[PDB]
Design an enzyme around this catalytic site. Structure first.
Site, short mmCIF file in Angstrom:
data_model
loop_
_atom_site.label_atom_id
_atom_site.label_comp_id
_atom_site.label_asym_id
_atom_site.label_seq_id
_atom_site.Cartn_x
_atom_site.Cartn_y
_atom_site.Cartn_z
N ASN A 115 0.84 -1.21 0.00
CA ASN A 115 0.00 0.00 0.00
C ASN A 115 0.87 1.25 0.00
O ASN A 115 1.94 1.32 0.64
CB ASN A 115 -1.02 0.03 1.15
CG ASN A 115 -0.43 0.59 2.42
OD1 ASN A 115 -0.44 1.82 2.62
ND2 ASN A 115 0.13 -0.29 3.27
N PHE A 119 -1.66 8.45 3.94
CA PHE A 119 -2.41 9.11 5.03
C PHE A 119 -3.62 9.86 4.48
O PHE A 119 -3.86 11.04 4.82
CB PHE A 119 -1.54 10.07 5.86
CG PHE A 119 -0.54 9.51 6.81
CD1 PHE A 119 -0.71 8.31 7.46
CD2 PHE A 119 0.45 10.36 7.31
CE1 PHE A 119 0.23 7.85 8.36
CE2 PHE A 119 1.35 9.93 8.27
CZ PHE A 119 1.23 8.66 8.78
N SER A 185 5.29 5.42 8.88
CA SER A 185 4.71 5.24 7.54
C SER A 185 5.82 5.32 6.50
O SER A 185 6.58 6.29 6.50
CB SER A 185 3.69 6.27 7.23
OG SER A 185 3.28 6.08 5.88
N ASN A 187 5.13 6.06 3.47
CA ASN A 187 4.40 6.72 2.36
C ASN A 187 4.24 8.22 2.58
O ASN A 187 3.53 8.85 1.78
CB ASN A 187 3.05 6.03 2.15
CG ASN A 187 3.24 4.56 1.86
OD1 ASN A 187 4.17 4.21 1.10
ND2 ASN A 187 2.44 3.71 2.48
N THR A 188 4.93 8.80 3.56
CA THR A 188 5.00 10.28 3.78
C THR A 188 6.49 10.66 3.79
O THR A 188 7.23 10.10 4.63
CB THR A 188 4.24 10.71 5.04
OG1 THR A 188 2.85 10.41 4.85
CG2 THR A 188 4.35 12.20 5.33
N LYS A 225 5.08 3.92 17.27
CA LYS A 225 5.06 2.82 16.29
C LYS A 225 6.27 2.95 15.38
O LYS A 225 6.44 4.00 14.73
CB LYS A 225 3.76 2.83 15.48
CG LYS A 225 3.63 1.64 14.53
CD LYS A 225 2.25 1.49 14.01
CE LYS A 225 2.10 0.31 13.09
NZ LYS A 225 0.69 0.21 12.62
N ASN A 254 5.37 -1.37 11.74
CA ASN A 254 4.72 -0.91 10.51
C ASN A 254 5.14 -1.81 9.33
O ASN A 254 5.84 -2.84 9.48
CB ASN A 254 5.06 0.57 10.28
CG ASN A 254 3.92 1.36 9.68
OD1 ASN A 254 3.30 0.91 8.71
ND2 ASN A 254 3.61 2.52 10.28
#
Ligand code: A1A4P
Ligand code: FMN
Ligand code: ORO
Ligand code: CL
Ligand code: CL
Ligand code: CL
Ligand code: CL
Ligand code: CL
Ligand code: CL
Ligand code: CL
Ligand code: CL
Ligand code: CL
Ligand code: CL
Length: 366
Positions: A115, A119, A185, A187-188, A225, A254
């Site tokens: 994925n 966010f 994450s 993805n940021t 996390k 994560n």
């Protein structure tokens, strides 16, 4: 194995996943769950599965990981599935769309997902009002051993990451049993840099000061996390900061930006975080190392590739007090929750443990 477990895993889920795009499948699942359109959760939680940690009773140690219910739409339906605790989020301060679609990819040959949602969030105000509508219902659920966690993120365009997390603490902290500072994450852009020692100490000092300013009955535990892709130096630094500041716990882990050798899915080279079976042992060994570095004194929620009681017990014996899953639910559907609980109870009895609590960190004592 129940009739439902076999029917869901062998027939219903592969049929539905074959008819739907992966993000459409996610959205429909949140709608089913929010309406309570769920198979019976036949499994009765035993005393063996109760865990006391983070200032709460947990009726069972199996939770839903962040990312399934990003916006707090399906909390009650997730408890109906048989989860012992629910984590919502990540939630960002302002609403934001996330990355362009497609942004979620199925690797069924690997029992994995990639994925890059980025966010996508309804934002703190919307989620605050959503949780306020059921605040006293949640107070009763928590008292009955069914706590709620809220996972906080940061906006893409924010110029002050620590202020985004501080805003989350102030707005959602009073509605949560625990908060998660998601600094992992993939993805940021720049987010995982917040796991570095100087950046994490500054960020977490501000988060803890904000949490400590909340009224007692509204004062949640704070967890961090972390990624499965940390260097040994990064892990030692995180352990040092957590102990120095009195962080209440860790969520480990994560998704991974690694692509383990052996992935078969056609979509293995998509950008994003990898979850499910290929992450499992990388997550377990991260739990093991964080438990050791924290001397077993810092509760860990273990997550990454759990689809069975054996997977749950391996994380518990490595140091997890609780476990979460998400990706297994995409392949097995709702009956996976009772499956994991039933298998975990059987293994605890087979291995001579009086309950979950007795097994936490047991590998370190061999
Ligand atoms: C990673 C994104 N992602 C994907 C794609 O990778 N799938 N997925 C997902 C789909 C799910 C379910 C749980 C899930 F996590 C689920 O539990 C159910 C389902 C079945 C019967 C009854 C009640 C329910 C709720 C149905 N579906 C789909 C097939 C409609 C999900 O979040
Ligand atoms: C589609 C998707 C979205 C996710 N979004 C988030 C998120 O918003 N916040 C977060 O902390 N973790 C997020 N995660 C990570 C999961 O919480 C979990 O740490 C990871 O997927 C490993 O568990 P699993 O192998 O059981 O899925 C997401 C995972 C998936 C699959
Ligand atoms: O929103 C996302 O893309 C996301 C966040 C996160 O923390 N983990 C993840 O795998 N995806
Ligand atoms: Cl319930
Ligand atoms: Cl796909
Ligand atoms: Cl909002
Ligand atoms: Cl409040
Ligand atoms: Cl504090
Ligand atoms: Cl609280
Ligand atoms: Cl290293
Ligand atoms: Cl790699
Ligand atoms: Cl990537
Ligand atoms: Cl085992």
């Amino acid at each position: 194995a129940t009739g439902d477990e076999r029917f869901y895993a062998e027939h219903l889920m592969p049929t539905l996943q074959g008819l739907l795009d992966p993000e459409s499948a996610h959205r429909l699942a949140v709608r089913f769950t929010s309406l309570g359109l769920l198979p019976r959760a036949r499994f009765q939680d035993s005393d063996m599965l109760e865990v006391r940690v983070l200032g709460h009773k947990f009726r069972n140690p199996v939770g839903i990981a962040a990312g399934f219910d990003k916006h707090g739409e399906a909390v009650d339906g997730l408890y109906k599935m048989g989860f012992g605790f629910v984590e919502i989020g990540s939630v960002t301060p302002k609403p934001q769309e996330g990355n362009p679609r497609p942004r979620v990819f199925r690797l069924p040959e690997d029992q994995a997902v990639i994925n890059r949602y980025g966010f996508n969030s309804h934002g703190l105000s919307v989620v605050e009002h959503r949780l306020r509508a059921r605040q006293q219902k949640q107070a009763k659920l928590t008292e009955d051993g069914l706590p709620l966690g809220v996972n906080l993120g940061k906006n893409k365009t924010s110029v002050d990451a620590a202020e985004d997390y501080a805003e989350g603490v102030r707005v959602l902290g009073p509605l949560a049993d625990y908060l998660v500072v998601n600094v992992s994450s993939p993805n940021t852009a720049g987010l995982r840099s917040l796991q570095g020692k100087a950046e994490l100490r500054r960020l977490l000092t501000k988060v803890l000061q904000e949490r400590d300013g909340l009224r007692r009955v509204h004062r949640p535990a704070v967890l961090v996390k972390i990624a499965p892709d940390l260097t040994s130096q990064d892990k030692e630094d995180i352990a040092s900061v957590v102990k120095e500041l009195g962080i209440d716990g860790l969520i480990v882990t994560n998704t991974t930006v690694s692509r383990p050798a052996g992935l078969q899915g056609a979509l293995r080279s998509e950008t994003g975080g990898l979850s499910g079976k290929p992450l499992r042992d990388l997550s377990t060994q991260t739990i093991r190392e964080m438990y050791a570095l924290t001397q077993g004194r810092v509760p860990i929620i273990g997550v990454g590739g759990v689809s069975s009681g054996q997977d749950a017990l391996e994380k518990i014996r490595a140091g997890a007090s609780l476990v979460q899953l998400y990706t297994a639910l995409t392949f097995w559907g709702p009956p996976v929750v009772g499956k994991v609980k039933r298998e975990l109870e059987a293994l605890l009895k087979e291995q001579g443990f009086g309950g979950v609590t007795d097994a936490i960190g047991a590998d370190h004592r061999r």
